[PDB]
Amino acid sequence: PQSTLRRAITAAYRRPETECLPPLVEAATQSKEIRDAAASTARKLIEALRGKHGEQFVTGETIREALKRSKELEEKGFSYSYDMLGEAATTAADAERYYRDYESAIHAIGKASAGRGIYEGPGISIKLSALHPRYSRAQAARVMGELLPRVKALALLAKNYDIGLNIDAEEADRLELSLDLLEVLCLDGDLSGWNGMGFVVQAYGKRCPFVLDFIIDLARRSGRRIMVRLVKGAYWDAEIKRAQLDADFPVFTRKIHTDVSYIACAAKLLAATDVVFPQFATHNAQTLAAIYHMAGKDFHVGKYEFQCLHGMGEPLYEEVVGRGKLDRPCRIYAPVGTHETLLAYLVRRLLENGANSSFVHRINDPKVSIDELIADPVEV
Amino acid sequence: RPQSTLRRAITAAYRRPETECLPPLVEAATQSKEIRDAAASTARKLIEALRGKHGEQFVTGETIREALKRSKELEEKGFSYSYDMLGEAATTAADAERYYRDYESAIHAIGKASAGRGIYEGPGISIKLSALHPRYSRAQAARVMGELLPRVKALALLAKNYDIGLNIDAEEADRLELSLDLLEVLCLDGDLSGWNGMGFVVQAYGKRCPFVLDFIIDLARRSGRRIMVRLVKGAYWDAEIKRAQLDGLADFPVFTRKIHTDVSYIACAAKLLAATDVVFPQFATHNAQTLAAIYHMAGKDFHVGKYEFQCLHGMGEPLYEEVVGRGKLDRPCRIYAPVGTHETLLAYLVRRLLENGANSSFVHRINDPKVSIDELIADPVEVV
């Protein structure tokens, strides 16, 4: 099981950052016309954002509460991806409870979807670390064989309701295990005809483009239109600190390299909308504007969508969704759970929202101009 | 070996099963029925005041200049301050020396502002040893002691020159031993004689806490220094749990039941309050029940310099507004004031998030509708 696509992923794992960049810079360079139009859109979005000035990140405690609070934005053009927030299960009983929480959430979301299907209707997202009691500490062999039956059962339930089921991306050293899991699922005949299988790839990772080449080819040969959520990445501080402890990082160390990687990978995804459903997860108005223009004038629901986190993205995406704005859909990621189960997620939201490098921090920073906010990362 | 019995007891507690550590803590933490009743009354009053009257709020200022200016208001009210030039986990040798210079310049600025108020009434500084050595948590204790001790001694000399407090913050449990050896060497150094501003944090969620306290009290006696001892419950609980599991340990260095840390804290406070001749106990807590318990445990005789409470800026001022001052409890409180930009502060803010957001934290429970004042004033000695 060492195809040329899989070898390319494994070969990029800790490739020197300096060598990772030129392909990304070239794949991320857009025409002057697209850059100019994206700068104009980005400026307009940012001017709207600056115009109108952890509970905010939790949609509700139960899926029933989250579903009721979602109708308002759903009729404005938003969709949802619900996550029964759990992660880093340390016990078998914890992994079982999270599973039964995901299982019952799928039933509630599936019934609420009511045949809207994978693009117009809500979906679910899961973290594999919630479903295996020693996900980060167990060898991939034993982790695959105990986790695959559980994810399959969830994917079959999502298939039964025709909703999306997305596998979230966590630490860099679990990418390979989750990727072999996605391949087995996309080749499993019990899930045939269902295009709701989803997968996150993190653009701060040096493997991201090769992971996308692998997934694009996997979608094309398997006949599954894989939903690929492109995120920049939530675990940067932790990847750096694990790398320094265990000296080539699996992630970029300059934020701008992640930004270039994201755009490069978005171009690759946008060229493959026949076989994958790109889901561009970002709160960065510049990133959004670039993807919006990179995608061209042709759009239909199901071609691609944007995504955001609940409590972070609605002010930006209220300038995007709907016929009076940009008429592009956005799926809101909806964490569901108690405050205790979501602490680790809120920590990551603190790291994301509080970093001087984050768009969402800079947009409130009176030292940061709009010209700086609309800068094209490749140019910089 | 010097202090062999006390040192062996620390090592012995490191590995002690949690259930074995608890009975002695419970025995020291049990107070009289008249005291428990007074403590419950005081804690009720403190909590009803809090619930009844009321993340950049944790940072006092970006410079020690703005931090020192912002201190006059609550100092006139009777608070004092301990500044930290927010820095930790030096990832480079240049980073350590930079932190050192910022600490050095901060002591000069804090010392000038103190203007001779002394180590109790005037401001002090707190430092994290991980800011002053590159790869502090990774390099050996040979090169740590040999390069950190000269750096902290210089800082301690400057603080002595200005007669201000200099407190060594407590970090991960695996750094406790080297920090304790450092404290001992400084307290025995004649160059620092006559200055009682040397301070040291001990974390009550650690199994070693009462025995570290025995060692420090004993060090205070044989050195002639009146060591300032900041008793905290501990800021790294989630990290310690995760490190112990990843290091493969079968038993943790910290307690795993929050109420065990609460009993540990009260038991350690009792030990400290019986040694105020040779240590200056500094009770860092935002838990009104903990505070009430210590308040009545200390007795009715009080003078500034006997002990103090401490709190973190942005967390403790509402509670200690009900403490400081003749009209309230008439006990002092030193506000810990982090100084810095966004870098290094985010790591502090994460620890504040894990503290302010945990279902077991007092500051979370005080804002939780499902938690009654009854549960909040409950004595952990009795429930354990």
Ligand SMILES: *[C@@H](C)/C=C/N1c2cc(C)c(C)cc2N(C[C@H](O)[C@H](O)[C@H](O)COP(=O)(O)OP(=O)(O)OC[C@H]2O[C@@H](n3cnc4c(N)ncnc43)[C@H](O)[C@@H]2O)c2[nH]c(=O)[nH]c(=O)c21
């Ligand atoms: C489980 C709950 C996982 C969810 N999942 C997810 C799903 C959705 C729908 C969305 C919107 C996000 C996530 N998610 C978080 C995501 O990674 C972050 O939101 C994203 O990184 C933010 O990027 P963006 O809005 O474009 O902001 P910005 O332009 O500010 O970029 C910040 C970004 O840059 C990287 N960074 C910061 N500093 C550096 C340095 N020094 N070097 C390199 N890179 C750097 C960081 O990535 C930072 O976040 C999410 N993340 C994830 O890893 N896996 C998932 O499954 C999700």
Ligand SMILES: *[C@@H](C)/C=C/N1c2cc(C)c(C)cc2N(C[C@H](O)[C@H](O)[C@H](O)COP(=O)(O)OP(=O)(O)OC[C@H]2O[C@@H](n3cnc4c(N)ncnc43)[C@H](O)[C@@H]2O)c2[nH]c(=O)[nH]c(=O)c21
């Ligand atoms: C560098 C900036 C270091 C600062 N230092 C310090 C200095 C001052 C002046 C003050 C006030 C605090 C600290 N500091 C943080 C301190 O440890 C926490 O504030 C403290 O732990 C909070 O406790 P308290 O306010 O009394 O709240 P509460 O009753 O809620 O207890 C919370 C506490 O309980 C422990 N806990 C949580 N969960 C468990 C479980 N399951 N089992 C056992 N124990 C458990 C935790 O300790 C939790 O925080 C500080 N900490 C430090 O370790 N070192 C330092 O130098 C400081």
